[PDB]
Amino acid sequence: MMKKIDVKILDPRVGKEFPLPTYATSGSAGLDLRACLNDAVELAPGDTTLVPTGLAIHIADPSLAAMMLPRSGLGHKHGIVLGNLVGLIDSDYQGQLMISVWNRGQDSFTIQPGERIAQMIFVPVVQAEFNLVEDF
Amino acid sequence: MMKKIDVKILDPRVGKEFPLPTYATSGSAGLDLRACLNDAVELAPGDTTLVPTGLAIHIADPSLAAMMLPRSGLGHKHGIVLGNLVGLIDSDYQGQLMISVWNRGQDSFTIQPGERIAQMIFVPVVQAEFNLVEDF
Amino acid sequence: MMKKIDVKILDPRVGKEFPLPTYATSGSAGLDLRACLNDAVELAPGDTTLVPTGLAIHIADPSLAAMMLPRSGLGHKHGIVLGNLVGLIDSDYQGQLMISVWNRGQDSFTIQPGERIAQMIFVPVVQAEFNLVEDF
């Protein structure tokens, strides 16, 4: 229920110090993304930080998009979610996948190099052709 | 535009004290989920709580996933949203549907037993097969 | 990869003072929505406001829904996101598209008339037919 998606590695630690993203089970809908950091980053309550993944994708098919969402436990239990809430990746975006991380909780939290911090899903998207009407 | 989805009832009050989820209209995209609580829960500004639904689903088809989102009025007018922002349910998750509720507002809010507190949609998902390239 | 969607203009400034929504590129997944305001609105940290778009859509096909999400830069860099996090538009909703805007940041921000403040995507949705089982 695949679609081949081209991926390029931007940081030499990817696949060496921490693995490439993989589906945990065959019924899994998302892939976990990990923090490609040189040093751990401490987020006080309310802070946001942009975390690199060391990866770039090229979806290429305009009928597909990817969405980045918070990991469920981390968001619910530690208040570690995305600063833009939900990240949308277009079929033509070819830059590095960067994760906006926001501490919406009451406690400081430290992101460690290689920690899984977000999940990404691939969903079909439709481009609307607007038909202007004066009344429905 | 259905797909039959297996559902199991975990709490005897479901369908008795509050009904099973149903689509409001035939053009409705989501189903409202209700709080299966013994007692009302009061959320001060900033608090989060995990609310049981008394329900479990088994999507089973790996081409489909479900997403849980805030109810629009409650989120915009009362600041009652999800602590993990958007909840993703995999085709192989078979445990109880649990809702992470967060009061992102300035006022306390009390969740009453049986109140509709989130909505869920079923969307097609694609599993990516990564093709490693050195350049796009 | 279109679907024709009926659109009705509710405010005479739309298409005159600021253009109708358009896909930036042919591989773009979302459309940016702009604030249809008479006066700029200043949001202090924590405030929410409901912003009209001057537009109404009628999806009409029950197999499609639209989702409204924060713009990535504005959400990550200025803390300007949606108060209901993610807005869902049903195939039968025919009222004006209204955007719940929340300042989740630490600074005040002023929304100017015509500014792009959210993005919308059209995604296929499936209506579940529940099959009650006592065990999976």
UniProtKB/Swiss-Prot annotation, chains A, B, C:
Its main location: cytoplasm. Keywords: Cytoplasm, Hydrolase, Magnesium, Metal-binding, Nucleotide metabolism. It catalyses: dUTP + H2O = dUMP + diphosphate + H(+). Substrate binds at residues 71-73, 84, 88-90, 98. Pfam families: dUTPase. Its EC number is 3.6.1.23. It is found in: Cytoplasm. GO terms for molecular function: dUTP diphosphatase activity; identical protein binding; magnesium ion binding. It comes from the Bacteria. Pathway: Pyrimidine metabolism; dUMP biosynthesis; dUMP from dCTP (dUTP route): step 2/2. Its cofactor is Mg(2+). SUPFAM superfamilies: dUTPase-like. Changing residue 90 to N: Reduces catalytic activity 40000-fold. It is an enzyme of class 3 (hydrolase). GO terms for biological process: dUMP biosynthetic process; dUTP catabolic process; protein homotrimerization. GO terms for cellular component: cytosol; protein-containing complex. InterPro entries: dUTPase, dUTPase-like, dUTPase-like_sf, dUTPase_trimeric. This enzyme is involved in nucleotide metabolism: it produces dUMP, the immediate precursor of thymidine nucleotides and it decreases the intracellular concentration of dUTP so that uracil cannot be incorporated into DNA. Homotrimer. Belongs to the dUTPase family. The C-terminal 11 residues (motif 5) are important for function; its removal by trypsin decreases kcat about 40-fold with a less than 2-fold increase in KM for dUTP. This is Deoxyuridine 5'-triphosphate nucleotidohydrolase. It comes from Escherichia coli (strain K12). The lineage of its organism: Bacteria, Pseudomonadati, Pseudomonadota, Gammaproteobacteria, Enterobacterales.
